[PDB]
Design a protein around this ligand. Structure first.
Ligand SMILES: *[C@@H]1O[C@H](CO)[C@@H](O[C@@H]2O[C@H](CO)[C@@H](O[C@@H]3O[C@H](CO[C@H]4O[C@H](CO)[C@@H](O)[C@H](O[C@H]5O[C@H](CO)[C@@H](O)[C@H](O)[C@@H]5O[C@H]5O[C@H](CO)[C@@H](O)[C@H](O)[C@@H]5O)[C@@H]4O)[C@@H](O)[C@H](O[C@H]4O[C@H](CO)[C@@H](O)[C@H](O)[C@@H]4O[C@H]4O[C@H](CO)[C@@H](O)[C@H](O)[C@@H]4O)[C@@H]3O)[C@H](O)[C@H]2NC(C)=O)[C@H](O)[C@H]1NC(C)=O
Ligand SMILES: CC(=O)N1CCC(C2=NNC(=O)[C@H]2/N=N/c2ccc(Cl)cc2)CC1
Ligand SMILES: CC(=O)N1CCC(C2=NNC(=O)[C@H]2/N=N/c2ccc(Cl)cc2)CC1
Ligand SMILES: [Ca+2]
Ligand SMILES: [Cl-]
Ligand code: NA
Ligand code: NA
Ligand SMILES: [Zn+2]
Length: 805
């Protein structure tokens, strides 16, 4: 109940919200059915429209008009946005040449440049080029400010997950808004676009920018406009707030447009009907900028033009139906569309079987337009598993398609020609970023980056300390003319030991054999130098990684590779080696096929053993530095050390051997040498973070050898490929991956074929940022380069996507 008997006179769009049953005059009231009786009359005026005309100039203030052309309007702060253009001979902001904004040019009383976030729903990245002729205001912001060719949304590339990620810097798994539709079990409740449940605060985690601002004494306008408040009124309201007295005026503002998303669903991303909503968004930008110029704020305010996700062509006839795969299709609930999430229809049923459901959905049709996953097997780059609201069974749907349960769900719910929500690497899902103002750079292009990074920058722009988030603070410093954040390297927590020869062969009882009893003072001094780290500048190009947690580990040097060997996990945490363009691939000699050699620098008690692998009928093993790439027949013996061995499913060895035998050399040839760092990852609770020892759920049978959930590699070379990887003077180039360590290759439908037909495609799918690997390992890479730290941070957030142009 609301006693909606009070009034809004003089209170229109008040900034603080009064609590029921007092009636409300804030821009949120419409959504709660709690606006005072006179809200529309007083606060939502429309008379005479939104523009001044010649004959309105100098008029007698009529308070009934939507906006004013009277003489007192400037100081009343409520002129139509085009007032000075029509009634004072001034020019439109878009008509002026752009001039560099070297310093903030603000009215007296402004303690900091205001921030205005202009967010647009469904604004696909390629609209910037393809719609450029009809968006002159947006085009000026873009070319005169700082812009990226596109910005990467988060998965799922839905509206609510992405808007709330923009506001918090958090992955949907961490902020809790994991989709446009949700079921929570612990609450026991559902969340929908249509409805009032979405308004309960219990769904919304993290700390959004407006709360971060308020807690630190920076005032905020609202970030939530009611759907019925027209755009011209949102703009005029922001402009009025900007005329408030210094002690009442917000420092951060948001505008939101439901377009072009709304039209894109109906007409497809490039439907002829799309030109008009793009004209209209541009007009609104024009209005804001003319309005700022009027208030003399156009060289004072920082403006962010940002989208939530793009839009793809999707129609009803591109729908896969689960009723064509399953028989018990009535025993499940599907969250349908551009992604699938499956759970049991009823919690009282113990006859429900996820493994059988998955199996029934795997590679069943030659053309299948989706792939099922247990959520923990989804590519780690999606960061989409660590939330009770995310169902165990997930369907990644092909771009341009939908998944539905049964045909009845589609024709009794073609409506639509566009949709979004697909994997966030897909070109059609990419969106836009432009920054314009005194704090952003002038006429500057920046590389594509992820929307999780923006919260830190918005906080920097307002002098706020960001709440803990998934951005990497400093990775976007290159966007800004002046930075208040200078990042520093995390301190190394554990220092390594450097063991020498300490054990005799006969102390080892590991059940390993090698045919290596084959016998020179010249090359006896040589091998000693290699074990002391003579070749280390060759294979360790960027310094050793820093270990950022408490543990026990040894640095081990070899002719061809260096490693950091964990006495706790009984395997390297990391193995580093360089393969030059000219290097050669050899095979493993017949006599050294099953060879594993004790490492005399490392105690039997901290070594793996061959017997466990023999006893374990599921588990085999592989090597981190590949024997195939040894530099000499003598150096090859190094690759069979027990300290280079890691547990591998036979199914996984197919993937790993192909990467090591074929792909490393191909990358070296194409990139003019590569440096490779590889190692294990343990993430049994799928939270994206390194597991402690007591979290491991699987060991090689009858041993304390832990089984990795994933294997990573980081492959670095010179951005200037005319220079070899090992003699690079400038910026670096990186690609990385985190491969799931699986006992089958069910994920790859063509895995019965030669590795040359599927393995690389799998690896591409599991592309990763160096930063993802850092979280998963507790390691810190690139400690010793010539490059500035902000540049290294940008490099660590880079994702190689494998999409066309
Ligand atoms: C992306 O960035 C984010 C933010 O930096 C990273 O997430 C953080 O990771 C931290 C480590 O996992 C985590 O810290 C834990 O906090 C626990 C309490 O935290 C509450 O308060 C904070 C701060 O206000 C709040 O943010 C949290 O909000 C969560 O929960 C609410 C309501 O449930 C949700 O609405 C909200 O969305 C959010 O949910 C998300 O996080 C939780 C986990 O916290 C997930 O389960 C959800 O799925 C969802 O993703 C919290 O309300 C605190 O209790 C923990 O402490 C335990 O562990 C330490 C180890 O040092 C130990 O010392 C303690 O004693 C304690 O152990 C005890 O509890 C155990 C579990 O009950 C028990 O087993 C033991 O026996 C002990 O009794 C811990 O410190 C932090 O909360 C989140 N923050 C967020 C916002 O998610 C994220 O890691 C980054 N991602 C990547 C890939 O890097
Ligand atoms: C005390 C508390 O927690 N809250 C926060 C939530 C409400 C809001 N505060 N400020 C707003 O603009 C409004 N929600 N805005 C949003 C904008 C985008 C999105 Cl996806 C979701 C919400 C009421 C207060
Ligand atoms: C029902 C619900 O809660 N949502 C809120 C989100 C959408 C919005 N409706 N009105 C808004 O202004 C808009 N949020 N805008 C934002 C402005 C800035 C930023 Cl960073 C993020 C969002 C759809 C409805
Ligand atoms: Ca973990
Ligand atoms: Cl959804
Ligand atoms: Na075995
Ligand atoms: Na297969
Ligand atoms: Zn949409």
């Amino acid at each position: 109940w609301t006693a909606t008997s009070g009034s809004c006179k003089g209170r229109c769009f008040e900034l603080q919200e009064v609590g029921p049953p007092d009636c409300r005059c804030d821009n949120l009231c419409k959504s709660y059915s709690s606006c005072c009786h006179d809200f529309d009359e007083l606060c939502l005026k429309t008379a005479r429209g939104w523009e001044c005309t010649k004959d309105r100039c100098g008029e007698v203030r009529n308070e009934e008009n939507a906006c004013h052309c009277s003489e007192d309007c400037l100081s009343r702060g409520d002129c139509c946005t085009n007032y000075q253009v029509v009634c004072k001979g001034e020019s439109h902001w878009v008509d002026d040449d752009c001039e560099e904004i070297k310093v903030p040019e603000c009215p007296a009383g402004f303690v900091r440049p205001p921030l205005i976030i202009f967010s647009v729903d469904g604004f696909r990245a390629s609209y910037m080029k393809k719609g450029s002729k009809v968006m002159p205001n947006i085009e000026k912001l873009r070319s005169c400010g700082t812009h990226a060719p596109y910005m990467r949304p988060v998965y799922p590339t839905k509206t609510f997950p992405n808007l709330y990620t923009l506001a918090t810097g958090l992955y949907p798994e961490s902020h809790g808004i994991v989709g446009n539709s949700m079921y929570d079990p612990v609450f026991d409740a559902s969340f929908h676009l249509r409805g009032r449940e979405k308004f309960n605060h219990r769904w919304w985690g993290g700390q959004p920018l407006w709360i971060t601002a308020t807690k630190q004494g920076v005032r905020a306008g609202t970030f939530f406009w009611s759907v019925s408040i027209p755009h011209e009124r949102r703009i005029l309201t922001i402009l009025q707030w900007l005329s408030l007295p210094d002690n009442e005026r917000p420092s951060v503002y948001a505008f939101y447009s439901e377009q072009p998303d709304f039209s894109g669903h109906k007409y497809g991303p490039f439907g002829p009907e799309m030109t008009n909503p793009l004209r209209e968004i541009d007009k609104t930008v024009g209005q804001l900028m003319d309005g700022l110029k009027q208030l003399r704020l156009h060289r004072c305010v920082n403006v962010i033009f940002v989208g939530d996700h793009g839009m793809e062509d999707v129609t009803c006839d591109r729908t896969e139906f689960l009723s064509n795969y399953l028989t018990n299709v009535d025993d499940i609930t599907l969250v349908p569309g551009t992604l699938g999430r499956i759970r049991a229809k009823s919690i009282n049923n113990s006859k429900y079987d996820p493994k059988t459901i998955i199996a029934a959905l795997t590679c069943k049709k030659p053309d299948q337009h989706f792939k099922p996953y247990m959520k923990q097997h989804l590519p780690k780059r999606l960061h989409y598993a660590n939330n009770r609201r995310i169902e165990d069974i997930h369907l990644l749907v092909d771009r341009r398609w939908h998944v539905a349960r049964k045909p009845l769900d589609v024709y009794k719910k073609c409506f639509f020609q566009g949709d979004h929500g697909f994997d966030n690497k897909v070109n059609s899902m990419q969106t836009v970023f432009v920054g314009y103002g005194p704090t952003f750079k002038y006429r500057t292009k920046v590389p594509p980056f992820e929307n999780i990074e923006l919260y830190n920058v918005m906080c920097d722009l307002l002098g706020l300390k960001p709440a803990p988030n998934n951005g990497t603070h400093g990775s976007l410093n290159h966007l800004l003319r002046t930075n208040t954040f200078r990042p520093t390297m995390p301190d190394e927590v554990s220092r390594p030991n450097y063991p020498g020869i300490m054990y005799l062969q006969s102390e080892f009882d590991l059940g390993c054999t090698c045919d290596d009893k084959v016998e020179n003072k010249l090359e006896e001094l040589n091998k000693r130098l290699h074990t002391k780290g003579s070749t280390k500048e060759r294979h360790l190009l960027y310094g050793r990684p820093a270990v950022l947690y408490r543990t026990s580990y040894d640095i081990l040097y070899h002719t061809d590779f260096e490693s950091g060997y964990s006495e706790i996990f009984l395997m390297p945490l990391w193995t580093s080696y360089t393969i030059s363009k000219q290097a050669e691939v050899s095979s493993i000699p017949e006599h050294l096929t099953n060879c594993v050699r004790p490492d005399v620098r490392v105690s039997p008690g901290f070594s793996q053993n061959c017997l466990a692998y023999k006893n374990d009928k599921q588990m085999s093993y592989g090597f981190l530095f590949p024997p195939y790439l040894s530099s000499s027949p003598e150096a090859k013996y190094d690759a069979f050390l027990v300290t280079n061995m890691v547990p591998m499913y036979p199914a996984f060895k197919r993937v790993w051997a192909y990467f090591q035998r074929v792909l490393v050399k191909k990358y070296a040839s194409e990139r003019n040498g590569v440096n490779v760092i590889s190692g294990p990852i343990f993430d049994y609770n799928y939270d994206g973070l390194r597991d402690t020892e007591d979290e491991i759920k699987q060991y090689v049978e009858g041993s304390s050898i832990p089984v990795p959930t994933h294997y990573y590699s980081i492959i670095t070379s010179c951005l200037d490929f005319t220079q070899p990887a090992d003699k690079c003077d400038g910026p670096l180039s990186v690609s990385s991956f985190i491969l799931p360590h699986r006992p089958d290759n069910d994920e790859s439908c063509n895995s019965s074929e030669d590795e040359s037909k599927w393995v690389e495609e799998l690896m591409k799918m599991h592309t990763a940022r160096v930063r993802d690997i850092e979280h998963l390992t507790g390691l810190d890479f690139y400690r010793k380069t010539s490059r500035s730290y902000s540049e290294i941070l940008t490099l660590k957030t880079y994702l190689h996507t494998y999409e066309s142009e």
